[PDB]
Design a protein around this ligand. Structure first.
Ligand SMILES: [U]
Ligand SMILES: [U]
Ligand SMILES: [U]
Ligand SMILES: [U]
Ligand SMILES: [U]
Ligand SMILES: [U]
Ligand SMILES: [U]
Ligand SMILES: [U]
Length: 517
């Protein structure tokens, strides 16, 4: 952390953060969500990290070069160490990226190596070549070299994500799935795991072997698993919580902005809220049905009437303010809602649905005040505007994500936040073979457009292709875009170091500090 001249620090440097839900895992290769990555940034550090404003910056690698954007060479700092005192080496990254690629690991982020185009990843994922053929090598203990199959000028931007953080081979091998228990885990971030009580708390303590430990100020941070945004706000105002999770409750937010304005942080956020349709299951495999649901949802009622927290009505998957997005707003988004209703009713009538044989399906959401209130409103809107019936179902976070991967669903509430600021961080998740494709959407036209983006060496051609990829997605109604999120949360006045400037919200507790209060 960089404490400004003249700030007086509190004697006690501890922090309590709400983290939305119980994490899926602490293993960097078994996680895919925001709650998981929030904890992962404090424990595992990859080649690069985001600085306090979000820019990709030196992590374990102090410096790097590229040759034609295809061969990337990372110079690892000599004093990078794990929490057991042993050196972090390039061999750790070799093992780790191979373990990520290996289909036996079944990482939800195996395709992150396809997004970066690391040599031989397609055959490794498909079981055609062993994971040891991946295009990564340690040239020595402090030099990691990555070979890609085509130029990727933004490749380094991907490297702050948890999936490309190192994992300790000796602990993994000796302890299997219990390697992340407090008695066994070994970490190389600013913190180490002290306690992990499922559905209660995760407590981290400063890691004295961290190479940048002298700049770490917070000695202990606790992450809570509270999925009720009302409860999070309540335990923040009670004094227990220093920073809420960034999902705000419909019940209290308006009150909160008038009662504690200076604690209500509202910043740009590269995330999109949408209803994910299971594209492989009838009758959601019919484009007319998917289009009807997309058009009959009234975004203005949701965004400005039921939620009203500063979100913007959405018409695409990739947020329009992503670096490199130059999207074309479709004609349906400019129409009146009445005009969207008739078209939707028209397509569902065309699809074979009637008053006596209506469309009825499940709407799955992860346990939450916010998601439940939005799903009830969406259910009412769809019933009123399109005559469709929905049965709401809540599931805890970890189970909810597995359901979506399994495809044991009809429609699910969903949110994707960028992992790097470039349109492919969204668009690659809709590729036919992506491990993050929970829409179960498979379009050869869409896949071709994205494949074409690294075959040109021109940013405008690339942007035009991302725009056309969004149009292909829209044309097929793969999803139901709802709104682009704002990053809204409460932060106590004594928490220093959180700018709100990073649109990816890649917070590191090593950058924060507690002001005397
Ligand atoms: U004190
Ligand atoms: U650039
Ligand atoms: U940029
Ligand atoms: U269903
Ligand atoms: U509630
Ligand atoms: U460029
Ligand atoms: U105090
Ligand atoms: U105190």
């Amino acid at each position: 952390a960089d404490v400004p001249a003249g700030v007086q620090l509190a004697d006690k440097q501890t922090l309590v953060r709400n983290n939305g839900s119980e994490v899926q895992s602490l293993d960097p290769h078994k996680i895919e969500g925001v709650p998981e990555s929030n904890v992962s940034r404090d424990l595992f550090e990859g080649l690069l990290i985001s600085d306090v404003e979000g820019h990709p910056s030196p992590g374990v690698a102090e410096k790097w070069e590229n040759k034609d954007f295809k061969v990337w060479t990372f110079h690892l700092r000599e004093n990078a160490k794990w929490s057991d005192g042993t050196p972090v080496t390039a061999h750790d990254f070799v093992y780790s990226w191979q373990r990520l690629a290996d289909p036996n690991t079944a990482s939800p982020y195996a395709s992150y190596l396809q997004y970066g185009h690391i040599a031989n990843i397609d055959d490794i994922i498909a079981g055609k070549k062993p994971a040891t053929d991946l295009g990564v090598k340690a040239l020595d203990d402090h030099t990691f070299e990555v070979t890609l199959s085509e130029p990727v000028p933004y490749f380094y931007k991907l490297l702050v994500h948890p999936s490309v953080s190192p994992v300790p081979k000796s602990a993994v091998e000796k302890f299997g799935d219990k390697w992340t228990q407090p008695a066994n885990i070994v970490t190389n971030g600013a913190y180490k795991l002290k306690n992990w009580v499922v559905n209660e708390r995760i407590v981290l303590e400063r890691n004295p072997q961290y190479w940048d430990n002298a700049k770490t100020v917070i000695n202990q941070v606790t992450y809570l698993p509270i999925s009720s945004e009302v409860t999070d706000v309540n335990r923040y105002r009670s004094g227990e919580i220093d920073m809420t999770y960034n999902n705000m409750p419909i019940e209290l937010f308006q009150k909160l902005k008038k009662e504690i304005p200076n604690e209500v942080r509202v910043d740009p956020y590269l995330c999109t809220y949408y209803y994910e349709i299971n594209n492989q299951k009838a009758p959601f495999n019919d484009v007319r049905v998917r289009t009807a649901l997309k058009l009959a949802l009234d975004r203005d009622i949701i965004v400005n009437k039921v939620k009203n927290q500063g979100d913007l009505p959405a018409y695409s998957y990739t947020p329009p303010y992503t670096d490199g997005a130059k999207l074309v707003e479709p004609e349906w988004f400019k129409w009146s809602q009445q005009k969207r209703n008739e078209e939707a009713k028209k397509l569902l009538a065309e699809a074979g649905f009637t008053a006596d044989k209506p469309l009825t399906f499940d709407l799955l959401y992860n346990t939450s005040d916010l998601h439940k209130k939005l799903a009830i409103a969406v259910a009412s809107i769809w019933k009123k505007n399109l005559g469709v019936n929905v049965n709401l179902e809540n599931q805890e976070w970890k189970t909810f994500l597995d359901t979506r991967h399994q495809g044991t669903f009809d429609v699910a509430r969903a949110g994707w936040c960028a992992d790097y600021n470039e349109p492919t961080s969204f668009l690659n998740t809709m590729l036919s073979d992506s491990s993050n494709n929970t829409a179960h959407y498979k379009s050869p036209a869409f896949d071709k457009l994205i494949a074409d983006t690294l075959k040109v060496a021109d940013d405008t051609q690339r942007s035009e292709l991302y725009a056309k990829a969004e149009q292909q997605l829209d044309k097929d109604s793969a999803i139901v875009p709802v709104y682009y999120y704002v990053n809204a949360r409460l932060v106590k006045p004594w928490v220093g170091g959180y700018t709100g400037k990073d649109p990816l919200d890649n917070i590191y507790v090593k950058n924060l500090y507690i002001i005397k209060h």
